[PDB]
Amino acid sequence: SDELYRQSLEIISRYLREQATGAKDTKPMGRGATSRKALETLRRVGDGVQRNHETAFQGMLRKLDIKNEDDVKSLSRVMIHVFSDGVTNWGRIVTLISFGAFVAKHLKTINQESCIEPLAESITDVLVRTKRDWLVKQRGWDGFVEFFHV
């Protein structure tokens, strides 16, 4: 078991799917209150990030050339490269996930909605593998919710 991984995947995959489809998942969370609050936080902060960084996000998306599942498997390289360099903070974590939603929207437009699942899995894996101890020290998703509160 790996609760931090499980909860992160739940939050990130739900946010990406909802951003792509425009529809909210009514299914209960795997455990719960924290995840609901995290997802609410992402809707608010993430939508702003996508608006503020439209041009940068378009540029990154073009540089990747996601067309199929094989492209999604390789974008991990770029993601790790850009995300692991420099300092760690919640703003960069929101940027990581927000760009994920941006790509997920693109995937839906090119009829590759199934690729959203490995995309979410890849984002979660990079986040939790590279930032494990920082996330734990920052109190995980409870810390995230607190950081961006009101």
Chain residues binding ligand QHR by CB under 6 A are: 53, 56-57, 60, 63-64, 75, 78-79, 82-83, 92, 95-96, 99-100, 103, 123
Q: How many CB atoms lie within 10 A of CB 149?
A: 8
CB 78 within 8 A of CB 64: yes
Of the pair 15, 83, the CB lying nearest ligand QHR is at: 83
Tell me how far, at minimum, the Cβ of 80 lies from ligand QHR, in Å.
8
CA distance 137 to 2: 16
CA distance 49 to 91: 9
Of the pair 26, 109, the CB lying nearest ligand QHR is at: 109
Q: After which residues does a break in the chain occur, C–N more than 2.5 Å?
A: 31
CA distance 128 to 115: 20
Which of 108, 99, 2, 92 lies closest to 59 in space, CA to CA?
99
Of the pair 31, 44, the CB lying nearest ligand QHR is at: 44
Of the pair 31, 58, the CB lying nearest ligand QHR is at: 58
Tell me how far, at minimum, the Cβ of 23 lies from ligand QHR, in Å.
21
Tell me how far, at minimum, the Cβ of 89 lies from ligand QHR, in Å.
9
Tell me how far, at minimum, the Cβ of 81 lies from ligand QHR, in Å.
7
